UniProtKB/Swiss-Prot annotation:
This is Ryanodine receptor 2. It comes from Mus musculus. Highly expressed in heart, lung, cerebellum and brain. Detected at lower levels in adrenal gland, stomach, thymus, esophagus and ovary. It is found in: Sarcoplasmic reticulum membrane. Channel activity is modulated by phosphorylation. Phosphorylation is increased in failing heart, leading to calcium leaks and increased cytoplasmic Ca(2+) levels. The lineage of its organism: Eukaryota, Metazoa, Chordata, Craniata, Vertebrata. Cytosolic calcium-activated calcium channel that mediates the release of Ca(2+) from the sarcoplasmic reticulum into the cytosol and thereby plays a key role in triggering cardiac muscle contraction. Aberrant channel activation can lead to cardiac arrhythmia. In cardiac myocytes, calcium release is triggered by increased Ca(2+) cytosolic levels due to activation of the L-type calcium channel CACNA1C. The calcium channel activity is modulated by formation of heterotetramers with RYR3. Required for cellular calcium ion homeostasis. Required for embryonic heart development. The calcium release channel activity resides in the C-terminal region while the remaining part of the protein resides in the cytoplasm. Homotetramer. Can also form heterotetramers with RYR1 and RYR3. Interacts with CALM and S100A1; these interactions regulate channel activity. Identified in a complex composed of RYR2, FKBP1B, PKA catalytic subunit, PRKAR2A, AKAP6, and the protein phosphatases PP2A and PP1. Interacts directly with FKBP1B, PKA, PP1 and PP2A. Interacts with FKBP1A and FKBP1B; these interactions may stabilize the channel in its closed state and prevent Ca(2+) leaks. Interacts with SELENON. Identified in a complex, composed of FSD2, CMYA5 and RYR2. The gene is Ryr2. Belongs to the ryanodine receptor (TC 1.A.3.1) family. RYR2 subfamily. Disruption phenotype: Embryonically lethal. Embryos die at about 10 dpc, due to defects in heart tube development. Cardiac myotubes display enlarged rough endoplasmic reticulum and cytoplasmic vesicles that contain high levels of Ca(2+).
Length: 37
C-alpha cells in the first residue's frame, strides 16, 4: 500500500490530485500512534 502511494506521488503529473484513498488510510495510520513510571 505504501509503495502504491509512493509510486503515485513520484509519478510526474504537474498537479497533486485528491485521492480519497490516501485521506482515509493516512488518518488510520496516524491514529495507530508508584507505577506511573
Amino acid at each position: 500500500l505504501i509503495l502504491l502511494f509512493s509510486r503515485t506521488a513520484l509519478t510526474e503529473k504537474c498537479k497533486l490530485e485528491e485521492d480519497f484513498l490516501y485521506m482515509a488510510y493516512a488518518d488510520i495510520m496516524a491514529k495507530s500512534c508508584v507505577k506511573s513510571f
